[PDB]
């Protein structure tokens, strides 16, 4: 019959930003606040608790804060980097375990610092196997936002970033892929905003 | 460590299946919950020393099982398609004293219910080779792989580079895109990027291989449909390095 209110359900901050998460309960014997990280495709992992009796933990980056007269309790990223990017959970028990009330999750989104921007976007080789004629919007500032199509076959996918982890780089990317007749590359995301000085090769 | 299996599931509503989790840390407190998307997990069962001691109003077509210290089950049969979800094994409690208190999840069974498995349908993958205008641009080089038309929604995508998985330089779509959003039965796409240097792909001795293990059917279901029977299995598309033309 209890529960643990969890603000914000959505949080965006930049790498090197701070991010700090807010739950309130209501169960006043509660003595154990856990926070469980939860990665895409893995299981919930705690990464933080605070046993009560005090009002600070700390853990290199990450931080909690409880106040049991106020019944709110909060974690803290300081310099946060895009692993830290989860769905975060904070729960609240006073038996262990076996009776956590759980925060209803915030996802956490922690875009990279984007070095040098170089937007651009890029004709992919056709495959024997497919129709498909794909095309790749890469290397943009983070700044920038991808909307999808407006047209019926044509599938546009949300931004992604991958790390080339030998050469410390990261980078954003967009795939837009049809069968269509009408379809080549300097319209595909036209219902998005490029950058002004996107590059078009030929 | 906790370690289920398996890690997709897709069901009938007369199928039965198993779900195995096991922990060899000597906790004695095993946990079953349930986790429905953009959700927190939802207690189901709790064992203490193999004893059940929590149920949460779990419909008897779940019924659990714990053979042993280390093992705990959960049966599946009469499944409905609000069932589809993430089953996560926990386990906590370390042995006596000796130990502080902590809980760890496994990574879960993801399971979908359907009503009628006429509309499981494998995957069509395709590899996409670099654009060559990237190649001169950036010194880098992206594939892309393309999985499509499949449902429901159970793909692994991996990237294979001479015949070892690898992670870096990979960024694959969090969520399919749904090919008809409007239709409830609509098949899905998946997008998934490999990034090299330049160097790397113009080396026609490597290797790429995108791998979509797909969840589909068991031998145990039946299938009267005239095409395929879209079972369980894996689809592949490869490329190979292309020197300077
Ligand atoms: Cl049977
Ligand atoms: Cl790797």
């Known amino acids: 019959g209890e529960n643990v209110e969890q603000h914000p359900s959505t949080l965006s901050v930049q790498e090197g930003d701070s991010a700090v998460i807010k739950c309130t309960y209501s169960?006043?014997?509660?003595?154990?606040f856990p926070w469980y990280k939860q990665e895409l495709g893995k299981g919930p992992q705690l990464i933080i608790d605070?046993?009560?009796?005090?009002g600070e933990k700390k853990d290199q980056r990450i931080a909690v804060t409880l106040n049991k007269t106020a019944k709110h309790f909060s974690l803290h990223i300081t310099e946060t980097q895009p692993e830290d990017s989860a769905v975060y959970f904070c729960?609240?028990?006073?038996?262990?375990?076996?009776?956590?009330?759980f925060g209803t999750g915030t996802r956490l989104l922690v875009s990279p610092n984007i070095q040098n921007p170089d937007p651009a976007v890029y004709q992919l080789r056709d495959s024997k196997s497919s129709d498909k004629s794909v095309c790749l919007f890469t290397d943009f500032d983070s700044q920038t936002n991808v909307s999808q199509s407006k047209d019926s076959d044509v599938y546009i996918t949300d931004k992604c970033v991958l790390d080339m982890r030998s050469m410390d780089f990261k980078s954003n990317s967009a795939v837009a892929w049809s069968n269509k007749s009408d379809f080549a590359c300097a319209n595909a995301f036209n219902n998005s905003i490029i950058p002004e000085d996107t590059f078009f090769p030929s | 460590e906790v370690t289920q299996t398996p890690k997709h599931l897709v069901m009938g509503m007369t199928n039965k299946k198993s779900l195995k989790c096991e922990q060899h840390?000597?906790?004695?407190?095993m946990y079953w919950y349930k986790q429905k998307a953009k959700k927190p997990p939802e207690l189901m069962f709790v064992?203490?020393?193999?004893?059940?001691?929590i149920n949460e109003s779990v419909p008897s077509r779940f019924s659990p099982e714990c053979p042993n210290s280390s093992l705990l089950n959960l049966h599946l049969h009469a499944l409905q398609p609000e069932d589809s979800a993430l089953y996560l094994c926990?386990?906590?409690?370390?042995?006596?004293?000796?130990?502080?208190?902590?809980?760890?999840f496994g990574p879960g069974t993801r399971l979908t219910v359907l009503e009628d498995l006429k509309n499981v349908f494998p995957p069509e993958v395709a590899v996409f080779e670099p654009s060559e205008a990237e190649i001169s641009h950036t010194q880098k080089a992206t594939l892309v792989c393309l999985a499509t038309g499949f449902y429901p929604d159970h793909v692994e995508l991996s990237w294979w580079v001479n015949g070892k998985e690898v992670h870096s330089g990979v960024c694959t779509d969090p969520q399919p895109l749904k090919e008809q959003p409007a239709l409830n039965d609509s098949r899905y796409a998946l997008s998934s990027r490999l990034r090299v240097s330049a160097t790397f792909w113009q080396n026609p001795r490597n290797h790429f291989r995108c791998q979509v293990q797909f969840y589909g059917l068991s031998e145990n279901d039946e299938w009267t449909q005239d095409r395929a029977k879209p079972v369980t299995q894996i689809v592949s598309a490869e490329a190979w390095g292309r020197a300077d033309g």
């Open positions: 169960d006043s014997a509660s003595n154990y």
């Open positions: 064992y203490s020393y193999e004893k059940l001691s």
């Open positions: 840390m000597g906790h004695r407190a």
């Open positions: 926990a386990s906590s409690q370390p042995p006596l004293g000796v130990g502080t208190d902590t809980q760890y």
């Open positions: 729960a609240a028990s006073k038996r262990g375990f076996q009776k956590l009330v």
């Open positions: 605070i046993r009560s009796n005090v």
